Amino acid sequence: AQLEAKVEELLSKNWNLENEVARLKKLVGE
Amino acid sequence: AQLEAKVEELLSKNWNLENEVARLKKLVGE
Ligand code: NA
Ligand code: NA
Ligand code: NA
Ligand code: NA
């Protein structure tokens, strides 16, 4: 179902955001 | 169902992350 795809998009989006925040933390030494 | 709560937690988490990234962008003038 297309509902599964939207849940997968949310999961992917949260991973991308978490990984961005992680990279920023490593940049500013945190 | 508890499934609804977990989907709500994901949505909330993505909003919190998006808002953090937005605040960081405003800080560094972007
Ligand atoms: Na990903
Ligand atoms: Na992650
Ligand atoms: Na929120
Ligand atoms: Na938002």
From Swiss-Prot, chains A, B:
Annotated spans, Leucine-zipper: 3-24
UniProt PTM: Phosphorylated by the cyclin-CDK PCL5-PHO85.
Protein name: General control transcription factor GCN4
Organism: Saccharomyces cerevisiae (strain ATCC 204508 / S288c) (Baker's yeast)
Oligomeric and partner information: Homodimer. Each subunit binds overlapping and non-identical half-sites that flank the central CG base-pair in the pseudo-palindromic motif 5'-ATGA[CG]TCAT-3'. Interacts with the mediator tail; the interaction with GAL11/MED15 is direct. Interacts with the SAGA histone acetyltransferase complex. Interacts with the SWI/SNF chromatin remodeling complex.
Protein localization: Nucleus
Record gene name: GCN4
Disruption of the gene: reported phenotype: Abolishes recruitment of the mediator complex to the upstream activating sequence (UAS) of amino-acid starvation responsive genes. Decreases RNA level of genes involved in amino acid biosynthesis and cofactor biosynthesis during amino acid starvation or methyl methanesulfonate stress. Growth dependent on amino acid supplementation. Sensitive to amino acid starvation. Sensitive to purine starvation. Decreases cellular glycogen levels during glucose starvation.
Family: Belongs to the bZIP family. GCN4 subfamily.
Domains as described in the record: Residues 89 to 100 and 106 to 125 define the N-terminal activation domain (NTAD) and the central acidic activation domain (CAAD) respectively, which can function independently to promote high-level transcription of the target genes.
Expression triggers: Translation is induced by amino acid or purine starvation, or during growth in low or poor carbon sources. Translational repression during nutrient-rich conditions is dependent on four uORFs (upstream open reading frames) present in the 5'-UTR of the mRNA; these promote ribosome dissociation. Translational induction occurs in conditions reducing translation machinery efficiency, leading to ribosomes scanning over the uORFs, and increased translation of the mRNA. The rapid translational induction is followed by transcriptional induction at later time-points, independently of the uORF sequences.
Physiological role: Master transcriptional regulator that mediates the response to amino acid starvation. Binds variations of the DNA sequence 5'-ATGA[CG]TCAT-3' in canonical nucleosome-depleted 5'-positioned promoters, and also within coding sequences and 3' non-coding regions. During nutrient starvation (low or poor amino acid, carbon or purine sources), it activates genes required for amino acid biosynthesis and transport, autophagy, cofactor biosynthesis and transport, mitochondrial transport, and additional downstream transcription factors.
